[PDB]
Amino acid sequence: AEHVRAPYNGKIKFNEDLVHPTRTRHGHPAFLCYIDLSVIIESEDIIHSVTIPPKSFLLVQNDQYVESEQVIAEIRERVRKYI
Amino acid sequence: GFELDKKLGRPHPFIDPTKKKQIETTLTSDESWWNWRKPEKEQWSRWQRRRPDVETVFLKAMAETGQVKLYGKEPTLTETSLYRARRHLFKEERLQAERERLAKEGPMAFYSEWVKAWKRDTSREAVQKHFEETGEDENTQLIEMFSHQTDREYRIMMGTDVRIKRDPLAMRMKEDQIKQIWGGDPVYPTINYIQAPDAVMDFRGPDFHEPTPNMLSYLKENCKVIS
Amino acid sequence: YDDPPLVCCFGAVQKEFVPVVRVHDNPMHPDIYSQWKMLQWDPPEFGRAPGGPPSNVAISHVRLGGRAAFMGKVGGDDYGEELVLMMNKERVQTRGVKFDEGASTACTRVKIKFEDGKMKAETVKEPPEDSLLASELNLAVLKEARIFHFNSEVLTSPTMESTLFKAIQWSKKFGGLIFFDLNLPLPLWRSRNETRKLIKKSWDEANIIEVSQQELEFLLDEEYYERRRNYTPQYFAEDFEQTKNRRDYYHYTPEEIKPLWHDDLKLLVVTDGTLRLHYYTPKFDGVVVGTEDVLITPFTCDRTGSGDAVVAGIMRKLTTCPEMFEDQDVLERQLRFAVAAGIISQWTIGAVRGFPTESATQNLKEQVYVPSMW
Amino acid sequence: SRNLINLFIPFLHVEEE
Amino acid sequence: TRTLQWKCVESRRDSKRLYYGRFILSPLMKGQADTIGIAMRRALLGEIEGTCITRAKFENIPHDYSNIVGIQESVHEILMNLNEIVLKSNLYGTRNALICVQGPGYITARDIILPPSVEIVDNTQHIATLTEPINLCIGLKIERNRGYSSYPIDAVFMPVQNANHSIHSYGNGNEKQEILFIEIWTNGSLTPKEALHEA
Amino acid sequence: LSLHRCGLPREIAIELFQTFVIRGLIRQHLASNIGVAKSQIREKKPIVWEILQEVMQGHPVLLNRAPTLHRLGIQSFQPILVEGRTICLHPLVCKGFNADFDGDQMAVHVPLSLEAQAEARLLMFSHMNLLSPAIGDPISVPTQDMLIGLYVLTSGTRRGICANRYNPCEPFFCN
Amino acid sequence: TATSISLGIDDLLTIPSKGWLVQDAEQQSLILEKHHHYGNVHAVEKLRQSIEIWYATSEYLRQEMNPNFRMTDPFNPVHMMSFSGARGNASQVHQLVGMRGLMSDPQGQMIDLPIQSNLREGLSLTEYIISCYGARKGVVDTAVRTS
Amino acid sequence: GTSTIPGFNQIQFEGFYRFIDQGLIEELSQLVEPLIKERDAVYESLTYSSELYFIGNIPLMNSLGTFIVNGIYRVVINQILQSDMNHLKNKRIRSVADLLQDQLGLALALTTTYESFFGLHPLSQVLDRTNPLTQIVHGRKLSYLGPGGLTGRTANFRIRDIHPSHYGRICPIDTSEGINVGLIGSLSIHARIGDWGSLESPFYELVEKSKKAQIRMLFLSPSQDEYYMIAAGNSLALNRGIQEEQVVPARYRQEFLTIAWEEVHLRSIFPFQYFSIGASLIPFIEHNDANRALMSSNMQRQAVPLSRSEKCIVGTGLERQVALDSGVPAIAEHEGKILYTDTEKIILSGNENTLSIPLIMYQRSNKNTCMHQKPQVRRGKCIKKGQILADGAATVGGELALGKNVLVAYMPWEGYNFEDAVLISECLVYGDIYTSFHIRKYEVMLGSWVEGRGRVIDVRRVYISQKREIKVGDKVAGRHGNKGIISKILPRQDMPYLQDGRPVDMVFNPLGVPSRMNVGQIFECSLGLAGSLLDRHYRIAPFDERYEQEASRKLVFSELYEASKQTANPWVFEPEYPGKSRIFDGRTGDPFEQPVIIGKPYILKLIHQVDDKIHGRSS
Amino acid sequence: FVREDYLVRKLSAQELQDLVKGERKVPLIVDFYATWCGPCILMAQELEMLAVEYESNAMIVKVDTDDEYEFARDMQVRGLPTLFFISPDPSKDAIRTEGLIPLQMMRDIIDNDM
RNA sequence: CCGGCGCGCG
Ligand SMILES: [Mg+2]
């Protein structure tokens, strides 16, 4: 499991209708990606594009602000827990 | 301005201010999921202060002297990394400037910085006049001036040794500048740690247990072993 | 006049000697002093941030980057010279110190009597610390000093009372501010009314007053606030935060402070150790939330001199930030500095030995608080 | 050898009074 | 008068057995200062000879790890004190001295009967203290040597405690001259100037 | 040390080569019999060491570390007399022995017969055992300090922005 | 010897973005702990988040450790001691300049607390105790690797 | 042990007294003091025992916690066995009280069986008297072996592991090396043995307003350790809220959490709570990998007392406790005044009571190490009961002193520090810096030089002293797991020297730090240099980063700058590269290209050395 | 068989009253202390040393202010640590010293004033 | 010149 990280500070721009809502193993809302989704980061100087491979979890939302080196997507026994 | 400082390598912003745009408006926490919301109150972190280092102090010093100019008053981590990459060139420039100053002023004017008891004029013209009226050349006057230097001053002047080549910026750095390398005074006072090298440990002090009684004397005191 | 502005500490110069003494119900072993450190991390409430002589405040103020002068009298013996040397090595101005060749420093002559079947003592000859005359004052120091600081210990001596009031007139003439740091000694805890009558004049002569929570509650009403602290609702709490049984940090209303308020009072600070700093001004009032950690160093912690550090930090910020008296946010931001200074001062054995420097105090303030609170 | 000796001769120099 | 001069720019006697001296030598051609400095340092640290006690003879001692009644220090402590005595002599050979005193009192380095060719540097150096009037006769052996080594005494013959030197640019590169400083620490058996000349 | 040499303590050497030293003493008429030669050896006479040094020339020894995991755990070297009480070992043969100098010890053996000496000289010396039998990589390759020295030596010039402060808009040697 | 490589406290170079990345991981752990208390996530979701977010942060520091050394301090003594292949690997250097990451309890499971400090910064008392888990494993596993 | 570190022998002392109290009566279902003195029992090989009235002889325990049988010091160590099987709440600890009382059960079914118990029982061991550190740590060992206990083959693999119930009771670092790893434990500094055979550690109770709570320090058995939320963090954190909802790491139910302060019951506040004596003598231990901490503790137990001892510039503050509890120094048993002092004795008089205290002079240990004592007081000095009177071997001024402070550089030097070799200077040899006395015993005129060569010092049994200066092949080590063999000795003119001209005494390989991951030695060497110039000593408790980030760095860097400024030595602190300085080649006078970390660390000399390992055989 | 670790005895107000009323041959030194007071630890050690110094030539006693608060207030005690040096001659007047005074100061007071 | 037990080193 490799993590896609934001390469620049900017505004995340993608269409949320091409992704399927899900729930991560950490309990967070996310978008499941099954296609060649294109994500646009509107950086300070130049608008940049990040390609998200399919079968991957997109953890950010559209129009969200991201920082550099911040994880934006994730690609991809029995234990008893007591409360 | 730009497009020439960038070509020449002169100090310039990484991003051209004219060719710069804002990042519009982002989610306002009312159109965001719970896990992506900025917390209402600032959270204590233990990483909320920038770590002090040599690079920040030196970059601030060279920004004060005008050797380099930074984007703001406090150098960023990018600028600190760039200085760490290119720090030998600036030290070489400082050393070359010191060499030129020594060649221009002369040994008497240059080395009088570390001889404070020397009150005579150290200019080349004054040295020439002293030679004319006394017959003592520049070398004799230089030997005489070094005869008033103290051992502390001589040891400080060893940074000008041709084999040591101490940074001139570090030589003239003041205490308030140097203390910022490690971040200033420790919050826990060092006086708690300090002990005299000749100190004898007082075993009746507050940090020691009660004196250990003799086992036989302790047994007899409780009236359990007869004489 | 050189910067930072000078402050003057008036009173007795003593080594240690916490004045505030009351009865505590949790005594340790009478002989094994190795157990007495447990009362440093579980202190009596009145001894949470103890104060001391004005010399402690002067030394702490100088260590925090300020300039201070001490006004008082010592004997001409070895002890007086040693005290003056200790104050000099800390860069406290000594020109206001008067020497008495015929007096024994920190020594008082008393006569033991047996009135009504109980042993008692009465003063025969006052010590030189309590024997400073108005003719022995230093007029240059009183002219230069921007804050005049004193404790209620001088009110236990008539000579020092008269000298103190003359010095207050002189300081007010030249434009200085009067800092009354109460620090009630053992006699002044006997009853509320006599202490109020004894301190009324000095209280009304002061622009800045610092009292502990215990001192303020004793001066207003001890039983009322004790009852208010012990109150517990019978059926349910009035709000959720009252269900947590947290420590009481009650903030006194200015209406409750009204009996102790007067016209020349610019700032009143009530300190619950370093945990709470209740401040009152003619325009506003509030509380600065602080903290403490003496359990971080259980074997070197000592609370002696903590209140001196807090008062010295208050004076240090007041002399350089005149906007403190008029801006609430600035006042809280600068009082956090005094909170940090008091916190560090609890980490060392000995009051003078453990007084923090300005660099360490600022470092701890920036470490403890979030950056938006600096 | 001669250059070394010439380098260490001056330390034994004395001056006229 | 001379174009190249040397002078003592500082002389200091911190104690009776620790002398200090700093010397200058300018102007030197480039590269000469390094050669002079390294050779002078090695000569000062390795080539200068000293004199010290190397053998002490007792009479009523089973072994050097025993005590004497009436003397506070044991035989080992006495030998250690004897090893710290600083002597001066210009001659070679195994000279012998004598300690022949009666107590009580303090036995200092001025109680040693020396041959005329040997001198004491520090009169106040301690050997032993006598609490009662017991006889004490010790025969010593002294020779001049280099480096380091009847009970044998581990003698350290080097009289120069430490040395240092520095090289500084003289000025404008007309001939790129240099200035040499030399610092010498001795134990008082010879002055730093004497050490420089001997080196 | 050379790659084919080791340092032997004087006591170990005189113990191991005792019979050869006895023969050397008797051969040059410096000992009347075996008993006199043994007495001379026991007294540590200065002439015993000359004969020991003479007879150790050309006579190999076998060194061996404790956990012999492969055949390079025992190797043959030419012993020389070194001062002290320790065995001097070449730095380049430590990897084969898996040895470091923090307390390790080694055993020494002397081949007696001529066939054993020939075997040790022609099969077990380190200069014909430069390759490991497991896969064939070299075993006496410079490591650690030598590797850092070579890396620093062959680390070339500073180039580009690490060499010049500004955009640039060296001696020539015959041999 | 002529170059005389050495090793000081300053040479132990942490990458410039550790404080940024540790702060982000702390912010995400603080938010999820509150919502776990709210009943918005269950225990396994909280247990997985803390382990994986701090393992990803630890692994990212190790990846960027070498490019930081290569571009900004090529002649750093720590970098030269391992890039040349002389002594030490990237994992051991990460323990000195990055973060020790996560440890494991004896019965397989991972401890739900990261060691976010390196050996140059100084382990906390809690972190030092947790790091003793792997110290015991190494000595015990030695007694079975040989036998 | 509520407010101070308890006596390291208090467990043995309390156990023996309990055996005398109830163990004798519980088994008999009247003792007289021994006729032979404790010194006489060992001098002529007897057993220090007292008579029971004539049923038999009961051995007596020394105030240091060791028995004497046949003139041999013996220690009875504790055992762990079954009372989650590895939980400490299902265990019990058997002290000397249980072992001595149990033998009384066999004895009554005395003199012979007690004699055979110390000789033969595995839990009874010969006291290690190499140095004062070994004397005390031997008695605090915990073993799973012994009768009724598991064998190494019997040992389960889930055992030998660290259990969370061990925190504060069993040191997680200290363990035996080899097949017995994880089966030989060690008690913590503040650990105590409870009334149910369980180990207890003190914790500070945080309780609500309405509670008296006269003493807030209370000991937890491991059974009740689970059900408390114990925090180890501090309360130096504030945001716009209030202090109670600040989060800190905590322990609860065998796992680690991060909860608010208002949910914390107990606090761990003692600095040395979780470690044993060996691990508590390592300064800056939090910067060393725990793997080397185990080896560092073992190495400190092999240090040889030197003929002359000196205190460490940098320590932890536990050296004074070790010296007091070892019995090596002389401790006053009565207040009074000093009247006479010499090598053989010290005379103390107080309250019409005059006592004479004999002093040990060149005696032999079980490990062939010399013991010696020198007065620490002068005539006319007032003394409290329990204050030091004289200094023993490896003890200076009432502190443990196992090594020396020497000038050290960390650089490669021509392969003579390859791997783990150490290059030293001749000054350490002719200065007698690392010279130690060693005495053997063999079952001849006194003061004769036999030819094992040495001087005969005592005849009763022949004792031969051997003065051993440092040599090539000797082992030296620091307190951070940094061991090494001396491979080369150079003249002082050949060693690298500093910018003040002083040559260094040892040269260490810098390559040994990254692979071994012990950064604490770099911290100690830099601070040792600063203390020597400032005439300061430092006793620093571990984990100083609890106060602030990089607390050790701030302390070392600021003290380095203070020494540089006060002594006018700009090379001591370099702004360009703090802690490092350019040094010069002693052979050429040319500087080395890179700055070198230098300092004055504390280096020990270990028992493992040549003259005891060189062997040769012909036939 | 076992010597006591502390020579300074703790007295009540009534016991101190009886001691002062009764005939005295040696100077009497009265210490006022509280276990919650930090400076009182150092004073406790200093007075133990002083008691060791003056074996039978002086009497050192201590009064806890947590048990005799009213008695301490009556005797003009304004803080801690506070020492009272009472001369054996009833004609003379006692001396009260406030603060952590040096041991030499106590020796001087006892020698030249009691 | 034989075996057990304990402690260590690589
Ligand atoms: Mg090894």
First to last CA, chain H: 61
Tell me, in angstroms, the distance from the centre of ligand 1 to residue H147's CA: 35
Q: What is the dihedral of CA I29, I32, I37, I38, to 10 degrees?
A: -10
Residue B172 in contact with partner chain F when CB distance is under 8 A: no
Q: Taking CB atoms and an 8 Å cut-off, how many pairs form between chains C and I?
A: 161
F 102-161 near G (Cβ less than 8 A): 143-145, 147-152, 155
**Cis upstream peptide for C4 (omega within 30°):** yes
- Cβ contacts, strand J, under 7 angstroms: F 66-67, 99-100, 102-104; H 122, 125, 128, 143, 145, 176-178, 180, 184, 298-299, 302, 483, 608
Residue E2 in contact with partner chain D when CB distance is under 8 A: yes
Tell me which DSSP letter residue H23 carries: I
CB atoms within 10 A of CB H399: 29
B205 contacts I2? CB cut-off 8 A: no
CA atoms of H162 and C110, how far apart (whole Å):
66
Nearest by CB to E164, from H447, H491, H500: name it.
H500
CA atoms of F6 and H173, how far apart (whole Å):
40
Query: Considering only CB atoms, which residues of chain F are within 8 Å of chain H?
Result: 9, 11-16, 18-19, 84-86, 91, 94, 100-103, 105, 144-146, 148-149
Tell me which DSSP letter residue H19 carries: I
Question: Which amino acid makes up residue I59?
Answer: M
What tokens were used for H324?
Answer: 């007091």
CA atoms of G63 and G55, how far apart (whole Å):
12
Experimental method: cryo-EM
CA atoms of C132 and C137, how far apart (whole Å):
8
The answer to whether I114 touches I88, Cβ cutoff 8 Å, is yes
* DSSP E strand boundaries for H342-394: 345-350, 353-358, 361-364, 370-372, 374-375, 382-383, 388-391
* Nucleotide minimizing C1' to CA distance for residue H126: J6
Laid out side by side, the sheet with H184-186 consists of H91-94, H78-82, H141-143, H184-186
The answer to whether H422 touches H432, Cβ cutoff 8 Å, is no
Three-state secondary structure string covering G18-37:
HHHHHHHHHHHHHHHHHHHH
I62 contacts C17? CB cut-off 8 A: no
Which residues, 6+ apart, have CB-to-CB distance to E55 below 8 Å? Answer: E140, E141, E150, E151, E152, E153
Smallest Cα distance from A76 to chain G, Å: 14
Spatial CA neighbour of E128 closest among E187, E79, E57 = E79
Q: Please classify residue I2 by burial: count the beta carbons closer than 10 Å to its beta carbon, then call 0-12 exposed, 13-18 middle and 19+ buried.
A: middle
Residue B85 in contact with partner chain G when CB distance is under 8 A: yes
> Per-residue b/e over I54-93, b at no fewer than 16 CB within 10 Å?
beeebbbbbbbbbebbebbbbbbbbbbbbbbbbbeeeeeb
Angle at CA of residue H112, ends H108 and H115, nearest 5°: 115
Question: Which amino acid makes up residue G111?
Answer: I
The answer to whether A49 touches A14, Cβ cutoff 8 Å, is no
Task: List residues forming the annotated binding site of F.
Answer: 100, 102, 104
C-alpha pair distances (Å), G2 with each of C361, H500, H507, H593: 46, 20, 14, 7
C-alpha pair distances (Å), H247 with each of C116, H243, H263: 60, 9, 10
Tell me, in angstroms, the distance from the centre of ligand 1 to residue G105's CA: 30
Residue I35 in contact with partner chain B when CB distance is under 8 A: no
Gap from H128 CA to J2 C1', in Å? 28
CA atoms of G12 and I44, how far apart (whole Å):
49
Residue with token string 């020597």: H532
Neighbours of chain D (3+ CB pairs under 8 A): E
Give nucleotides in strand J with any atom < 7 A to a protein C-beta: 5-10
- Classify strands H382-383 and H336-341 as parallel, antiparallel or unpaired: antiparallel
Q: How many helices, marked H, and strands, marked E, lie in chain A?
A: 0, 9
Nearest by CB to A27, from G17, G41, G52: name it.
G41
Smallest Cα distance from G88 to chain B, Å: 23
Which residues, 6+ apart, have CB-to-CB distance to F136 below 8 Å? Answer: none
Angle at CA of residue H523, ends H518 and H524, nearest 5°: 100
Contacts of G48 in chain A (CB under 8 A): 25-26
Q: Torsion-angle region of residue C52: left (phi > 0), alpha (psi -120 to 50) or beta? A: beta
C-alpha pair distances (Å), F154 with each of D15, F151, G5, H511: 53, 5, 15, 20
Tell me which DSSP letter residue C121 carries: E
First to last CA, chain D: 32
CA atoms of H445 and C72, how far apart (whole Å):
77
* DSSP E strand boundaries for H253-352: 255-260, 266-267, 314-315, 330-331, 336-341, 345-350
Smallest Cα distance from A80 to chain G, Å: 10
Question: Which amino acid makes up residue B12?
Answer: H
H helix runs in C179-253, sequence order: 192-204, 213-220, 222-230
* DSSP E strand boundaries for chain C: 6-10, 67-75, 97-100, 107-113, 120-125, 147-151, 177-181, 208-212, 267-272, 276-280, 285-289
Spatial CA neighbour of C119 closest among I113, I91, I9, I73 = I73
Residue with token string 């929570």: C213
E196 contacts D13? CB cut-off 8 A: no
CB atoms within 10 A of CB F161: 14
Residue of B nearest to G29 (CA): B35
The answer to whether E138 touches E56, Cβ cutoff 8 Å, is yes
Query: HSE on the CB side for A28, CA within 13 Å?
Result: 27
Q: Which run of H or E residues covers position B90? A: helix B77-105
Q: Which residues pair with H202 in a beta bridge?
A: H219
- Which value in Å is the resolution of this experimental model? 2.6
Tell me, in angstroms, the distance from the centre of ligand 1 to residue H475's CA: 12
Contacts by A58-62, CB closer than 8 A, 24 or more apart: A58/A14, A58/A19, A58/A30, A58/A31, A58/A32, A58/A33, A59/A24, A59/A28, A59/A30, A59/A31, A60/A12, A60/B36, A61/A12, A61/A16, A61/B27, A61/B32, A61/B33, A61/B36, A62/A12, A62/A13, A62/A14, A62/A15, A62/A16
What tokens were used for H82?
Answer: 């079954």
Dihedral sign from CA coordinates of E70, E71, E73, E76: negative
Tell me, in angstroms, the distance from the centre of ligand 1 to residue G120's CA: 26
Nearest residue for J8, CA–C1' = H177
CA atoms of H369 and H305, how far apart (whole Å):
7
I101 contacts C79? CB cut-off 8 A: yes
C-alpha pair distances (Å), H339 with each of G117, H350, H379: 57, 10, 5
C293 contacts H236? CB cut-off 8 A: yes
Single out the catalytic residue among I16, I40, I63, I106.
Answer: I40
Q: Please classify residue A13 by burial: count the beta carbons closer than 10 Å to its beta carbon, then call 0-12 exposed, 13-18 middle and 19+ buried.
A: middle
Tell me, in angstroms, the distance from the centre of ligand 1 to residue G71's CA: 37
* Nucleotide minimizing C1' to CA distance for residue F105: J10
Nearest by CB to H237, from B44, B54, B184: name it.
B44
Which residues, 6+ apart, have CB-to-CB distance to H26 below 8 Å? Answer: H101
What tokens were used for C256?
Answer: 């409750």
C82 contacts I66? CB cut-off 8 A: no
I37 is catalytic: yes
CB atoms within 10 A of CB E133: 11
CA atoms of G60 and G21, how far apart (whole Å):
9
Tell me which DSSP letter residue C76 carries: S
CA atoms of E151 and C138, how far apart (whole Å):
72
Tell me which DSSP letter residue G102 carries: -
Spatial CA neighbour of B91 closest among B61, B123, B48, B119 = B61
Q: Which run of H or E residues covers position H320? A: helix H319-326
I47 is catalytic: no
Residue E1 in contact with partner chain D when CB distance is under 8 A: yes
CA atoms of F72 and H531, how far apart (whole Å):
49
The answer to whether G102 touches H245, Cβ cutoff 8 Å, is no
> Per-residue b/e over H182-208, b at no fewer than 16 CB within 10 Å?
bbbbbbbbbbbbeeebbbbbbbbebee
What tokens were used for I64?
Answer: 């806890």
The answer to whether H546 touches H552, Cβ cutoff 8 Å, is no
Residue E73 in contact with partner chain H when CB distance is under 8 A: yes
* DSSP E strand boundaries for F21-153: 61-64, 74-82, 107-109
Single out the catalytic residue among I7, I20, I37, I101.
Answer: I37
**C-alpha of H300 from chain center:** 7
Residue I1 in contact with partner chain B when CB distance is under 8 A: yes
Residue of E nearest to B110 (CA): E171
SS3 at position H304: coil
Q: Torsion-angle region of residue C69: left (phi > 0), alpha (psi -120 to 50) or beta? A: beta
Nearest by CB to E6, from D4, D7, D11: name it.
D11
E66 contacts H501? CB cut-off 8 A: no
Which residues, 6+ apart, have CB-to-CB distance to H436 below 8 Å? Answer: H304, H305, H306, H307, H369, H370, H467, H468, H605
Q: How many helices, marked H, and strands, marked E, lie in chain I?
A: 4, 5
- Classify strands C6-10 and C147-151 as parallel, antiparallel or unpaired: parallel
CB atoms within 10 A of CB H104: 22
Question: Which amino acid makes up residue C67?
Answer: R
The answer to whether H520 touches H480, Cβ cutoff 8 Å, is yes
Q: Please classify residue B95 by burial: count the beta carbons closer than 10 Å to its beta carbon, then call 0-12 exposed, 13-18 middle and 19+ buried.
A: middle
Q: How many helices, marked H, and strands, marked E, lie in chain F?
A: 7, 4
Tell me, in angstroms, the distance from the centre of ligand 1 to residue H153's CA: 27
CA atoms of C312 and C61, how far apart (whole Å):
5
Question: Torsions phi, psi of C70, nearest 5?
Answer: -105, 135
Contacts of A9 in chain B (CB under 8 A): 23
First to last CA, chain B: 102
Neighbours of chain H (3+ CB pairs under 8 A): B, C, E, F, G, I
CA atoms of E117 and H42, how far apart (whole Å):
54
Nearest by CB to I105, from C36, C79, C108: name it.
C79
Q: Which residues pair with E140 in a beta bridge?
A: E56, E97
Spatial CA neighbour of G77 closest among H510, A3, C168 = H510
Gap from F67 CA to J3 C1', in Å? 27
Tell me, in angstroms, the distance from the centre of ligand 1 to residue H476's CA: 14
> Residue length, chain C?
374
Gap from C27 CA to J7 C1', in Å? 49
The answer to whether H330 touches H388, Cβ cutoff 8 Å, is yes
